[PDB]
Amino acid sequence: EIDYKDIATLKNYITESGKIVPSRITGTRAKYQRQLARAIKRARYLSLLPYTDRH
Amino acid sequence: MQVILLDKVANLGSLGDQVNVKAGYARNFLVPQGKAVPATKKNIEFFEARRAELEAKLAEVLAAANARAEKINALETVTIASKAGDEGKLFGSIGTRDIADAVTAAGVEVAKSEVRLPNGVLRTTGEHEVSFQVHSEVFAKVIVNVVAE
Amino acid sequence: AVVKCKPTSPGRRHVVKVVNPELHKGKPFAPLLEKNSKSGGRNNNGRITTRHIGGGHKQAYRIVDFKRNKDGIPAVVERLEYDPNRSANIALVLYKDGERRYILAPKGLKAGDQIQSGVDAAIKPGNTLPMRNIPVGSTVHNVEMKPGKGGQLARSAGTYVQIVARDGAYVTLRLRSGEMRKVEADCRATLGEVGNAEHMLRVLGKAGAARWRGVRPTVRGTAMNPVDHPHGGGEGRNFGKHPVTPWGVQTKGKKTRSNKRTDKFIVRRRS
Amino acid sequence: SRVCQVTGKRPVTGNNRSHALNATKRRFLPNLHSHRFWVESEKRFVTLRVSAKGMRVIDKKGIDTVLAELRARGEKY
Amino acid sequence: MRHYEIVFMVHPDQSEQVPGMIERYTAAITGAEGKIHRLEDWGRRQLAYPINKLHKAHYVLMNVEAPQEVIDELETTFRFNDAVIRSMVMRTKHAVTEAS
RNA sequence: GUUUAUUAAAAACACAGCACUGUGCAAACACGAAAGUGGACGUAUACGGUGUGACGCCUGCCCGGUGCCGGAAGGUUAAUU
Ligand SMILES: [Mg+2]
Ligand SMILES: [Mg+2]
Ligand SMILES: [Mg+2]
Ligand SMILES: [Mg+2]
Ligand SMILES: [Mg+2]
Ligand SMILES: [Mg+2]
Ligand SMILES: [Mg+2]
């Protein structure tokens, strides 16, 4: 359902260092986190998001 | 060895000056060219005989070279075609030979060895600036338009 | 495929064959052959300038197109056939204009496959392009060293060359030996590796097999007399000497390259 | 035929003496080099096998003068 | 006959020529009886991290419905095309037309 | 299989296999004052040299000495000046 091109929402689920926030913090459901993890990893490949704050 | 210059030289001297140069420089470059000849009493007196003529002869050729230089600049743009692939990247190349022929085609006779391409050999489609060195002290410019269907 | 011979007799126990059913079973292309009389290691003075050469099966040379200057004309692989002059196989290709030539068979080429040579040819195995057009990192064989001279690198059965990098007018190549060398980008190269990669797995199995391909026995230096070889004699098995060639030059470590002309193209040696 | 075409220098024989004065026969070869000389009088290059000393003779005497001597001697160039 | 979503990155120096790429690619999909459902030219944008010493690239988003063979050679075009970098293709169970 | 033709046929030589090492092509190497020729109309799955000697299980410790390879700061050091 959730799409990786929507970077604005993904910014809320990544820390300042680019880490993917844990589910227990955000409180998202398990199914959506798996989609979320794929989306963030996929944006990183396209450089829509940074892998880490150091480059 | 000691030689006297028959033509202007950048870092060596002007016409008529007797200068000392390496044997290799004179034997391999100056003497084979018309720039200088060995400086001996036989040549010095003989050189003095046409001292005025050589200076006058050299003066007009620079003007003559300049005269043919401006008309080269008149053809500000020249159109050529080559094997151009996708992205405009030319599969082949357009060297001094192709450019030399193009300028003469419906233009002015141009030597194939005095064209200057500092950037490269124009391996990509587009517009490039090619400099021309027609005489030692004068330069010329022209734009080469390269495109293909 | 590689098949072992059953030990029905000594000399066949260890024989391992490399059988390729795809190779043409008939005679080669007649108008593209020529005489290949053997030499036996003798030079124009009649002296043996290279030992352990002589005899073997008669062979006829067949002209292989190492240059591939037929630009823009596609060709179809008619068949693959045996070539006694080299480890690799040669593919007979028919240009649709009506010309026939031999080329080194790439790794995957088969009868009926299309090939093309030229600057605008597609990036596909068997095609020949200048290395300035081939993508960096591509695996190529039959690599040229001077433009228009013909391929001279990676001609063996399973050899290939990798284009590690390109800059200026030169392309850096990693040769099969591990050496990295510079070559002009205008030189031509053939995409893909040479076929018959299973050539190294064959085992001759017997002395006669070596003789069939013109290799004569090699006599150990230590088995000679002092007058014949530096390793010389000595009653019993005595060596007591640093290994050397028959002419006294040390072996097992001593370098021999002395070409000051071509070091500018050698970015790094094999090791 | 390591013979200079201008000066006629040819290899000569001699000995090399060691610290113990052992004499072994040797040769002294001329410093020959194939060089192209432009004949101003003929608008062309002429190739000659000349020694380094012969090269200096060309400068002092001129290429035109020496070729006359080579022609007179019968040397082909 | 499967849907696909294709995002390919073009070199900034070839930004002006990007529209040339789209027409050629769409022709290949259409020429093989395929169709394009979405097509966006996002233009120049800032890269999150450098890519081959490059900080800004031209972005193109294209969603198509083409057979396997059409996409196969399309990938090969990206591979050997130096102008385009870091291209990916998707599989989707339905066509998409929203801007997103 | 080969060998001391004419006192030695063997455990000797060769051998397939194995390992080290050299060689990027005008290859190393070898015959040649040189040209040139072989290696090879071959191109590192190739070629030369060396040792070992099918195959099976294996091949341990030592780099001080000699050799080879790599290094270059320092010491010593030729012609030349
Ligand atoms: Mg041998
Ligand atoms: Mg052996
Ligand atoms: Mg003995
Ligand atoms: Mg003993
Ligand atoms: Mg017997
Ligand atoms: Mg006997
Ligand atoms: Mg033994």
In E, minimum Cα distance to A44 occurs at: E48
Q: Report helix, strand or coil for D36.
A: strand
C147 contacts in chain B (CB < 8 Å): none
Longest dimension (CA), chain B: 67
Of the candidates C113, C132, C164, which is a domain's last residue?
C113
CA of C229 to C1' of F8 (A): 24
Instruction: Measure CA E22 to chain center.
Output: 8
Tell whether the torsion through CA atoms of E41, E43, E45 and E50 is positive or negative.
positive
**For residues E2 and E25, is the Cβ–Cβ distance under 8 A?**
no
CA of C259 to C1' of F25 (A): 11
Strands B138-146 and B77-80: parallel
Ligand 4 mean position to C8 CA, how many Å? 40
Q: Report helix, strand or coil for B68.
A: helix
Q: Give the Cα separation of C226 and C234 in Å (integer).
A: 8
**For residues D16 and D24, is the Cβ–Cβ distance under 8 A?**
yes
How distant, in Å, are the alpha carbons of A49, C251, E12, E86 from that of E56? Answer: 14, 58, 7, 13
Q: Report helix, strand or coil for B134.
A: strand
Residue-number span of the structural domain to which B106 is assigned: 69-148
**How big is the B-D interface in CB pairs under 8 Å?**
13
Dihedral, CA of residue C132, residue C137, residue C139 and residue C141, to nearest 10: 40
D49 forms beta bridges with D34
Q: Give the Cα separation of C135 and C119 in Å (integer).
A: 13
Q: Give the Cα separation of C133 and B95 in Å (integer).
A: 17
Ligand 5 mean position to C41 CA, how many Å? 30
Q: Which tokens go with B103? A: 């300028």
The answer to whether E86 contacts A44, with C-beta atoms less than 8 Å apart, is no
Q: After which residues is chain E broken (C to N over 2.5 A)?
A: none
Q: Give the Cα separation of C74 and B121 in Å (integer).
A: 29
Q: Which tokens go with C257? A: 């390259």
**Could you tell me the residue ranges of all domains in chain E?**
1-92
Nucleotides of F under 7 A from a protein CB: 12-17, 20-33, 36-39, 41-55, 66-70
Residue C122 and residue C146 in one domain = yes
CA E16, E17, E20 angle in degrees (round to 5)?
A: 140
- For residue C127, give the DSSP letter: -
Q: Which residues hold their Cβ within 5 A of ligand 2, which is an ion?
A: C 218
- Cite the beta strand spans of C145-213 per DSSP E: 151-153, 161-167, 170-174, 180-184, 188-191
Sequence length of chain A is 55
Dihedral, CA of residue B66, residue B67, residue B71 and residue B76, to nearest 10: 20
**Nearest nucleotide relative to C46: CA against C1':** F31
Q: Which tokens go with A18? A: 């680019």
Sequence length of chain B is 149
* Matching residue, tokens 């890519």: E51
Strands B36-38 and C161-167: unpaired
Q: Give the Cα separation of C95 and C117 in Å (integer).
A: 11
CA of A32 to C1' of F53 (A): 69
* Matching residue, tokens 């290279």: C50
**Nearest nucleotide relative to C245: CA against C1':** F49
The answer to whether D59 contacts B23, with C-beta atoms less than 8 Å apart, is yes
Strands B138-146 and C2-4: unpaired
Q: Give the Cα separation of E36 and E97 in Å (integer).
A: 10
| Best CA proximity match to C74, nearest among C95, C105, C104 | C95
Residue C148 and residue C179 in one domain = yes
Residue C83 and residue C126 in one domain = no
Q: Report helix, strand or coil for B15.
A: coil
Sequence length of chain E is 100
Give the number of other CB atoms < 10 A from CB of residue E80. Answer: 14
The minimal CB distance from E51 to the residues A47, A48, A50 is found for A47
Q: Give the Cα separation of C91 and C110 in Å (integer).
A: 8
Helices (H), E1-100: 18-31, 68-80
| Best CA proximity match to E63, nearest among E41, E83, E37, E88 | E37
Q: Which tokens go with A22? A: 């844990």
Q: Which amino acid is at B42?
A: K
Tell whether the torsion through CA atoms of D45, D50, D52 and D53 is positive or negative.
negative
| Best CA proximity match to B25, nearest among B44, B9, B40, B43 | B9
Residue C109 and residue C132 in one domain = no
CA of C255 to C1' of F24 (A): 14
Q: Report helix, strand or coil for C190.
A: strand
Q: Give the Cα separation of B100 and B94 in Å (integer).
A: 10
Residue-number span of the structural domain to which C244 is assigned: 195-271
The minimal CB distance from B1 to the residues D38, D40, D59 is found for D59
Q: Report helix, strand or coil for C184.
A: strand
State the resolution, in angstroms: 2.3
D32 forms beta bridges with D51
The number of the ligand nearest the C-alpha atom of C238 reads 4
Radius of gyration of chain D (CA): 16
Q: Which tokens go with E68? A: 């396997």
Q: Give the Cα separation of B1 and B18 in Å (integer).
A: 10
Give the number of other CB atoms < 10 A from CB of residue B31. Answer: 20
Q: Give the Cα separation of A52 and D6 in Å (integer).
A: 78
Provide DSSP, C2-54: EEEPP-SSTTTSS-EEE--TTS--S---GGGEE-----TTB-TTS-BSSSS--
Longest dimension (CA), chain A: 32
CATH number at residue C227: 4.10.950.10
**For residues C42 and C63, is the Cβ–Cβ distance under 8 A?**
no
Strands C170-174 and C180-184: antiparallel
The minimal CB distance from D38 to the residues B1, B31, B38 is found for B31
Q: How many CA atoms lie within 13 A of C167 on its CB side?
A: 5
Q: Is D60 exposed, middle or buried (0-12, 13-18, 19+ CB in 10 A)?
A: exposed
E79 contacts in chain C (CB < 8 Å): 135
Domain count, chain C: 3
Q: After which residues is chain B broken (C to N over 2.5 A)?
A: none
Instruction: Measure CA D48 to chain center.
Output: 9
Q: Give the Cα separation of E33 and E12 in Å (integer).
A: 31
B62 contact partners, CB below 8 Å, separation of at least 6: B135, B137, B138
**For residues E82 and E18, is the Cβ–Cβ distance under 8 A?**
no
Sequence length of chain C is 271
Q: Report helix, strand or coil for C129.
A: strand
Of the candidates C85, C113, C141, which is a domain's last residue?
C113
Give the number of other CB atoms < 10 A from CB of residue D61. Answer: 12
| Best CA proximity match to B30, nearest among C107, C7, C17, D59 | D59
Q: Which tokens go with E3? A: 């849907």
**For residues D30 and D51, is the Cβ–Cβ distance under 8 A?**
yes
Ligand 3 mean position to C206 CA, how many Å? 25
The answer to whether B83 contacts C133, with C-beta atoms less than 8 Å apart, is no
CATH number at residue B138: 3.10.430.100
Q: Which amino acid is at E3?
A: H
Element (H, E) at D16: strand D12-17
* Matching residue, tokens 């979320």: A36
* φ/ψ bin of C240: left (φ > 0), alpha (ψ from -120 to 50), beta (otherwise): left
| Best CA proximity match to E24, nearest among B87, B149, C122, B83 | B87
CA C130, E84, E49 angle in degrees (round to 5)?
A: 120
C62 forms beta bridges with C33
**How big is the C-E interface in CB pairs under 8 Å?**
3
Q: Is C127 exposed, middle or buried (0-12, 13-18, 19+ CB in 10 A)?
A: buried
* Matching residue, tokens 């036989």: B42
Q: Give the Cα separation of E37 and E88 in Å (integer).
A: 17
Element (H, E) at C62: strand C61-62
Please list, residue by residue across A7-38, b when 16 or more beta carbons sit within 10 angstroms of its beta carbon and e when fewer do: eeebeebbeeebebeebeeeebeeeebeebee
In D, minimum Cα distance to B2 occurs at: D59
**For residues B36 and B15, is the Cβ–Cβ distance under 8 A?**
no
